[PDB]
Amino acid sequence: PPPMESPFQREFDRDRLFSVVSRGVPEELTGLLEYLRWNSKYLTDSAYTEGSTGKTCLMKAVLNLQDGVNACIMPLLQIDKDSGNPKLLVNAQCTDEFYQGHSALHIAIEKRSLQCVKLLVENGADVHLRACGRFFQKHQGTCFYFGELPLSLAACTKQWDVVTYLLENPHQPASLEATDSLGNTVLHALVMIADNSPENSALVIHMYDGLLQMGARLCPTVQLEEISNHQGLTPLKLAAKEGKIEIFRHILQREFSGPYQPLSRKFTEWCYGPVRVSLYDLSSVDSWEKNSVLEIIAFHCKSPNRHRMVVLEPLNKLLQEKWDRLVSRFFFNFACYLVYMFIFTVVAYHQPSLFGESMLLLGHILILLGGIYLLLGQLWYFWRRRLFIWISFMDSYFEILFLLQALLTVLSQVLRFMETEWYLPLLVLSLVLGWLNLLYYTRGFQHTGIYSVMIQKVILRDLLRFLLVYLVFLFGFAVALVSLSREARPAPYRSILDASLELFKFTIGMGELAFQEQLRFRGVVLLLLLAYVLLTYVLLLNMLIALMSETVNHVADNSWSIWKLQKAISVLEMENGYWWCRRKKHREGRLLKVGTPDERWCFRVEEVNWAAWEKTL
């Protein structure tokens, strides 16, 4: 990409004007103006910009600032005012793919100079110009997405007085409910620029609260937190989706006092010594609405801090009371699945060769009904999550296996109907997958669920890479053993499968090595087996030590948070009912008149904290 400003890199005439404005002498510009009258030219023509981007001369003026001061910018406004052009200069943007839309007010705000932005919009510059280049889009290397607006650029770079001036100027008041070409307003942009660093979280929380208060002062009828982008997300939902937790935590529990009391969510109902009763707001933070923060946290967000967002209140108490409401249906589902797997096990064990036969036919048609029921249920589940199939796959890996087992038992039943003798491996693989999928329902109990999310420390990629190295080793020594044991002076290592088995048996502790005098090269085969044993012993040892050093590092125990996330995913998948009885969901919380006719569907938590009471003591 071309650089915007470059102190020694080459990109009136063009170079003469660019050098005299890079210095910025206001009298040495004299002699330019009449030169524009003879040729009927303007300052925004393609011969007077950098023809690739379109970076005009005033953009170089606001780029090169003498300590934030430039004496030549208002000369350029006088020249463009009396240059005969219908169109302006300050509204003119670049045209390259990389800096598409990047005006000069963006540079005047970026350089943190109140004087130049004041002298720009006091002399008729636009404040809504969208800098929409690829440099200004997120999730790309060398990028800066600030929200594609001058007010969002002033907000995302901490410049307080430029925000208050841009909202409180008599020339052009910037729309606090404006948008970019992505749909994002300025609070969306503060959410997008946030990280999980503590100081950046403090900066974005500071600018968010201050901008929300100025929205109360300036535009009190509209509500800024209820505006959605082109994906239909409020800034709370955008903070839940893109994984920024600390601004999400700050928005979720927010208490203000006095005139800014209406734009709080954590109203305090009462207190009594150490007990404190708060009334949180469930404005789109519950599963009653279609697209809300619970469904976005569970099924839409792709981030590793996603399991920490169900820890914090009111989401803890909301998910806890939803789970207390639905734990009877969870264990009813588990009992139905246990009955189905008992039918599967008794049908498979008592299977005939290739009254009792009638009862087994009853069992077989019950298996086909249960299989087509689970198959339609899992297909409906994957159709509901059709937008994000990689977010139904990254964590909840049992919804793949329930589908796979149901598909395999339906296919095995139609292979039994179609006479084929290859149905019994499919029915057995279905039975194995069903008894394995029985361990999905261990979430509902506290301690075994905590252990079942604790028993997955060893990373699946960390296993597959070891399987790659071990299969290289086993295959190399397998072809080696068969091609050395091809000749003689039963026969071991006769085929590559039998030698692969006899080399794999060293890993399970059943491997036999001997000085087999049937072979001709018995010393070389014994030395090669010894080399295989030593190499795979070093291999398994290095895997054990490196995996233990990756795990045992005093890292924070996640198992309570991931267990609460798994129960949250389960209760949100369960609240829609089945695929035939689509039930109606409780509007959780009581509707309370709070402040001003603003009635909110509030949900009270009643929490005690002896440490917090004794420090407010």
Please, which of residues 204-243 interact with ligand P0T by CB under 6 A? Answer: none
**Contacts to its own copies from residues 525-584, by CB under 8 A:** 526, 528, 530-531, 533, 537-539, 541-554
Based on the shown chain and the rule CB under 8 A, indicate whether residue 143 belongs to the binding site for its own copies: yes
Q: How far is the CB of 445 from ligand P0T (least distance, A)?
A: 24
User: CA dist 551 to 454, 458, 555, Å?
Assistant: 12, 8, 8
**Closer CB to ligand P0T, 346 or 467, in the complex:** 467
Cβ-defined contacts of 388-392 (< 8 Å, 24+): 388/299, 388/300, 388/302, 390/302, 391/299, 391/300, 391/301, 391/302, 392/299
DSSP-based three-state secondary structure for 56:
coil
Binds ligand P0T by CB under 6 A, chosen from 42, 256, 470, 613: 470
Distance CA 305, CA 194 (A): 14
**Amino acid in position 435:** W
DSSP-based three-state secondary structure for 605:
strand
* Segment lying near ligand P0T (by CB under 6 A), choices 18-26, 192-200, 304-312, 534-542: 534-542
Binds ligand P0T by CB under 6 A, chosen from 327, 368, 376, 540: 540
User: Binding partner of residue 470 among ligand P0T, its own copies, none, CB under 5 to 8 Å per kind?
Assistant: ligand P0T
Distance CA 588, CA 571 (A): 14
DSSP-based three-state secondary structure for 501:
helix
Binds its own copies by CB under 8 A, chosen from 98, 260, 466, 601: 466
Distance CA 273, CA 119 (A): 56
Binds its own copies by CB under 8 A, chosen from 424, 558, 560, 578: 424
Based on the shown chain and the rule CB under 8 A, indicate whether residue 272 belongs to the binding site for its own copies: yes
Based on the shown chain and the rule CB under 6 A, indicate whether residue 534 belongs to the binding site for ligand P0T: yes
* Beta bridge partners of residue 66, listed in sequence order: 69
Interaction pattern, residues 46-85, with its own copies; x per rule: CB under 8 A: ----------------------------------------
Based on the shown chain and the rule CB under 6 A, indicate whether residue 12 belongs to the binding site for ligand P0T: no
- DSSP secondary structure of 381-448: HHHHT-S-SSTTTSS--HHHHHHHHHHHHHHHHHHHHTT-TTHHHHHHHHHHHHHHHGGGGGGGSHHH
* Segment lying near ligand P0T (by CB under 6 A), choices 245-253, 303-311, 437-445, 538-546: 538-546
Q: How far is the CB of 371 from ligand P0T (least distance, A)?
A: 23
- Among 41, 54, 45, which residue's Cα sits nearest to residue 84? 41
Q: How far is the CB of 40 from its own copies (least distance, A)?
A: 34
* Segment lying near ligand P0T (by CB under 6 A), choices 186-194, 391-399, 421-429, 537-545: 537-545
* Segment lying near its own copies (by CB under 8 A), choices 29-37, 114-122, 381-389, 426-434: 426-434
Based on the shown chain and the rule CB under 6 A, indicate whether residue 429 belongs to the binding site for ligand P0T: no
Query: Do residues 17 and 65 make contact, with C-beta atoms less than 8 angstroms apart?
Result: no
The pair of three-digit structure tokens given for residue 473, joined into one six-digit string: 């080793």
User: Binding partner of residue 462 among ligand P0T, its own copies, none, CB under 5 to 8 Å per kind?
Assistant: its own copies
**Closer CB to ligand P0T, 256 or 470, in the complex:** 470
- Among 56, 61, 32, which residue's Cα sits nearest to residue 45? 56
**Closer CB to its own copies, 25 or 531, in the complex:** 531
Element (H, E) at 332: helix 315-349
Q: Which residues bind ligand P0T (CB under 6 A)?
A: 463, 466-467, 470, 507, 534-535, 537-538, 540-541
